[PDB]
């Protein structure tokens with residue numbers, strides 16, 4: 649039980665090249681079988697990775713009243729906390745420099761150029777990794793001519809989750825089982841492990857914290873008509889130390905729609921089209937939390953599997 653490891657060294661990785669075609673096959677197979685993979689990413693230096701970790705702590709160290717200024721939508725960017733367990737919040741529209749500048753001046757009226765420049769740089773570099781990976785998936789399904797339309801006005805999110813020292817060694821649950829509602833999520837654990845995936849079998853893979861982890865969200869699973877797997881995951885601390893994760897999410901401009909090419913006799917249409925803002929909100933309500941672990945419990949489900 650160990651994840652695929654995919655070398656996304658940007659060197660040599662241009663469309664049409666030999667290395668690109670090899671990496672494309674690895675990405676498609678990993679996201680079909682596991683829904684995730686460890687990724688070696690040099691689009692971001694170790695120096696920038698540590699700077700973004702420091703910026704996450706600086707944001708989460710602000711007063712509660714300041715963090716609340718980022719709104720009441722914890723399904724996307726809003727401040728969330730389970731007392732004595734975890735806290736988190738996000739920078740929405742991280743690839744829009746004007747939106748990052750506004751967010752920064754909301755949090756730091758006297759200014760914080762270091763925070764704004766660091767997080768925008770990381771968001772831009774990780775969005776290119778997301779773009780390349782989606783492109784490889786589209787190419788793998790014969791859909792490269794539909795790719796630019798899919799990607800128009802992609803929404804990117806940078807999200808920090810912090811986990812308090814659990815007070816014990818061994819094993820301390822810290823975040824509950826869910827599927828992400830992104831297209832892709834790219835996670836860095838900042839040298840402390842705990843992210844844990846359920847296999848299709850029902851086994852558990854707890855990777856080390858040396859590399860980025862790519863995982864599929866329910867938007868890509870729906871786009872693929874269930875051909876790709878969105879994996880169930882949770883966080884379990886394995887040591888008495890604090891943990892901060894840095895995660896990059898892609899979301900569509902508005903609608904996800906499954907292309908006709910991926911529907912056939914053996915693969916009936918699983919999901920009607922749906923709006924991401926509605927899905928995200930719904931999963932955070934009492935009546936809609938059934939959809940957190942399974943998009944088939946959402947209103948878009950066709951009932952095809954009877």
Ligand SMILES: [Fe+3]
Nearest residue numbers: 826827828881
């Ligand atoms: Fe997640």
